[PDB]
Symmetry: C4
Subunit: 175 residues, 4 copies
């Protein structure tokens, strides 16, 4: 019943910012006996992000943790705004608005836990996921059907493209 | 039955946890270089931080021993790390005496048979959906979320709520 | 539509496959030492071996590039390993020309948009439950089992059955 | 139910496939050439319990890895036969050298290479995600899946059949 409300918020998005753990991954933090840390991403999310970028949308990562894995994933996907070691997601997002000349109302943010709440609440289009905390889900404009690390990002990428009448055009390039 | 669960959680000063099956989904991972791997859940970290910040002491009691457990514990401020110990009750009782906290003010979460007595005898005993039937049977509470998937975060929030500390935790992010 | 599916599968001489989301569940795994990991499914290995032994040529066509794919392919006797190639149809047509096999006698299994044209134009196009809707729409068959969980094994058995080789394959183990 | 218990009651040797039984069947490779395999904690306790009750534990697998050696060592799995082409002839060979009749052997497997061993063992076991043909010749199919408690489940079944289960539980009470 909220589809066109969601569409109106997504239609004006010029910047798409994302949390990592629980969004681009299923939230697993993986350590081994040699001190090495591991993180897993989802292939379909990659193509979804490529689609947004192709449509002219600026991509950003804002995470409280810091790893080479995030740097590597961001670089291969052409995400050039990689903010790590930053729990205060909203201040980081506002920082980007000033850096890039994009209004906050034209920014999307997807997050899963409490550090993401304010950014999800205050962004033009705030998104969460089924396994997100209840409080961040409560302030979201949209909650994905697919879970983090299992297509949540791909799903909201398609949603934004649809709201901007760019989805069918993108699909047609593969047909 | 949440009223009696909140009543038990109200008095908790020490929260002790098994590792495999609780903080992880129970996978023991090895590779051809001789390296062992373990996986944890990001939301459990924030939950344990909230518990610690509220004044509750955190402990790990595990039958295995690994560097991953030391790293994760250090990262989350788990100050009492007991590894290579299958006898969970003796370990928990040892902690009660050392810290000066009654067993009735201890919470313990476990998943398999070695955890049974500690879950049964602790002031607040918790298990998980994929815990063994016998350990689930003696639990005061079984989580909705599974081990390595938010069971720990869930218990953390329950204890915070019971102690009127949950909304203060949430408020910092609003 | 199974009579039509069997018709298409009956004449397959080349079986070509996407990797991520087909042979794996789609996870791209990195670690802090710059190492990449990929996971495959054991039962898929036997299925592909069976297809190969029945006289079908095996091929991989993937947009990514890794040593893990080379290793898995060599292990299973996948003889055409095309990596760093998102244009699946051009690669597949290239194979038809090199091997002297009509496109109508090629099978292709894929999960996402880059695979769409190949799935559509191949003699037998296959996708998977978690494949994108657009690639599923142009498929001749969609597996019950998921990518990295037996989707490949399933279609291998389907092709063996369509070519009257399945029961004979089973018989070798009895 | 009772026919299963009759077959399980006299088991002296419990032999197992690895991939799809002790694991969920994932074969994991990395860019440094390193292979990974995952096991389940609850299976560990189940196997240890079986071993302590006097049952000899064995692994018979077509693949070969250090991970299997490591997991076997920590659980007291004392016969580790890797890289085996024919699992039935490996089981027959092992049970002959140990002086145990095949009728007193259990074997759990998931795929076609396990079929003959599951069929011919005194107690043959498979798993839900096992192939239909191996499931067809099994005396018992577990409810839990490989790498997710299938082994723990059958261990408890055998303990029950040998009047050792309630005592096993009681040691933890
Ligand atoms: Mg997160
Ligand atoms: Mg445990
Ligand atoms: Mg793919
Ligand atoms: Mg197997």
């Amino acid at each position: 019943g909220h589809m066109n409300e969601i569409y109106q918020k997504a239609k004006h998005i010029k910047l798409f910012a994302m949390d990592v753990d629980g969004i681009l991954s299923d939230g697993q933090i993986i350590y081994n006996s040699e001190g090495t840390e591991t993180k897993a991403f989802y292939v379909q999310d990659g193509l979804g992000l490529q689609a947004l970028k192709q449509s002219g949308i600026i991509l950003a990562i804002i995470t409280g943790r810091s790893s080479a894995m995030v740097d590597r994933r961001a670089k291969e996907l052409g995400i050039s705004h990689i903010i790590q070691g930053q729990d205060d997601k909203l201040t980081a997002l506002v920082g980007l608005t000033k850096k890039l000349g994009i209004e906050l109302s034209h920014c999307a943010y997807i997050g899963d836990d409490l550090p993401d709440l304010k950014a999800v609440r205050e962004a033009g289009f705030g998104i969460s996921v089924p396994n997100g905390c209840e409080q961040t889900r409560a302030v979201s404009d949209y909650i994905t059907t697919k879970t983090g690390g299992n297509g949540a990002v791909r799903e909201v990428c398609e949603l934004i493209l649809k709201a901007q009448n760019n989805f069918d055009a993108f699909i047609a390039t593969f047909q």
